[PDB]
Design a protein around this ligand. Structure first.
Ligand code: NA
Ligand code: NA
Length: 342
């Protein structure tokens, strides 16, 4: 027979993590929010049962060794060897050991009921935490939100790119207005913006010619395309009118990007919430492994003492079984005593 190796820190830390996750998680499903609180509540109850079982079973097992029959049965059986008085000594000593054995069975029956009581209790705790169903179509939900996150991020990226193009198209028209305003082109050329050929004839330095000549050509070409002008010349008021439409469209894109960034926080919070629920299931799996080993240990402990008192009573064998079972509990207490959670 071998006892399970149990880490109660891994058990208790997992219960601690379920509590933390069940309260910060914000997937916004609500029934999941309630079910996660059920798991944390029953998880803490399981942890309480595990912590109480150790000093409970220690108390029960420690009552057996100090009994008189452990020592006196060895003294009876050792003196029940040599040629003795067959009635006065031998018959009487047999009836004395039968009295001791009846008390030994009665005590060992009692500690077995205590071990079974802890096993059945831990089994009820394991049932409570495990029976809460949380992963029904949660892999489906995680896929849905990440798909919605993908197209929102894709929309923001396109919107930002379409805005970036409109920003330069706007800035090209602004540069055209600046050279018109700086050199008073509206004063010379009435109503319509001067052509590229007309700008050459102006009294300007050669670097200044190419400066304004490129500005006008670029801003006019853009403005004409926006107003649907593929025929006539461009007026100054039409240049400002062309900019006004771009400012309206850029402002509209900024508003649309703000609404998308609100939705993006929504999906990211819900994906984070779904990931915490997935983590709660993994923390629950971790603690149940340790919890199942406690149930197993007590049922092993019970049947081990049962087999000692089924047939012939090996007084001194039982003393080893108790001390081995006690050393196992001493270890569990050592873990709880020096436990540092986080
Ligand atoms: Na409780
Ligand atoms: Na129940």
């Amino acid at each position: 027979v071998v006892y399970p190796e149990i880490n109660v820190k891994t058990l208790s830390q997992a219960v601690k993590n379920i509590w933390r996750l069940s309260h910060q998680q914000k997937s916004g499903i609500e029934i999941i929010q309630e079910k996660t609180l059920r798991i944390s509540l029953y998880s803490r109850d399981l942890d309480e049962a595990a912590r109480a079982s150790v000093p409970q079973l220690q108390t029960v097992l420690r009552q057996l060794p100090p009994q008189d029959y452990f020592l006196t049965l060895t003294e009876i059986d050792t003196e029940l060897e040599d040629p003795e008085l067959d009635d006065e000594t031998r018959n009487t000593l047999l009836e004395a050991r039968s009295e001791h054995i009846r008390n030994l069975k009665k005590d060992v029956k009692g500690v077995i009921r205590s071990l079974r009581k802890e096993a059945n209790l831990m089994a009820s705790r394991i049932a409570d935490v495990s029976n809460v169903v949380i992963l029904e179509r949660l892999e489906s939900s995680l896929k849905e939100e990440q798909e919605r996150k993908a197209e929102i991020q894709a929309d923001i990226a396109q919107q930002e790119k379409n805005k970036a193009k409109l920003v330069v198209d706007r800035n090209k028209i602004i540069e055209s207005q600046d050279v018109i305003r700086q050199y008073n082109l509206a004063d010379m050329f009435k109503d319509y913006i001067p052509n590229i050929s007309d700008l050459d004839k102006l009294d300007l330095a050669n670097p200044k010619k190419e400066l304004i000549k490129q500005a006008i050509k670029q801003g006019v070409e853009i403005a004409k395309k926006i107003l649907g002008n593929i025929s006539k010349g461009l007026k100054y008021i039409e240049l400002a009118d062309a900019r006004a439409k771009l400012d309206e469209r850029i402002n509209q894109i900024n508003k649309d990007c703000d609404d998308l960034k609100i939705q993006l926080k929504g999906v990211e919070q819900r994906i984070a919430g779904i990931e915490d629920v997935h983590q709660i299931d993994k923390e629950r799996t971790t603690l149940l492994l340790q919890a199942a080993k406690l149930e197993q240990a007590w049922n092993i402990f019970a049947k081990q003492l049962q087999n000692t008192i089924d047939g012939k009573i090996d007084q001194q064998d039982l003393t080893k079984i108790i001390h081995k079972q006690l050393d196992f509990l001493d270890d569990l207490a050592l873990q709880y005593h020096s436990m540092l959670l986080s």
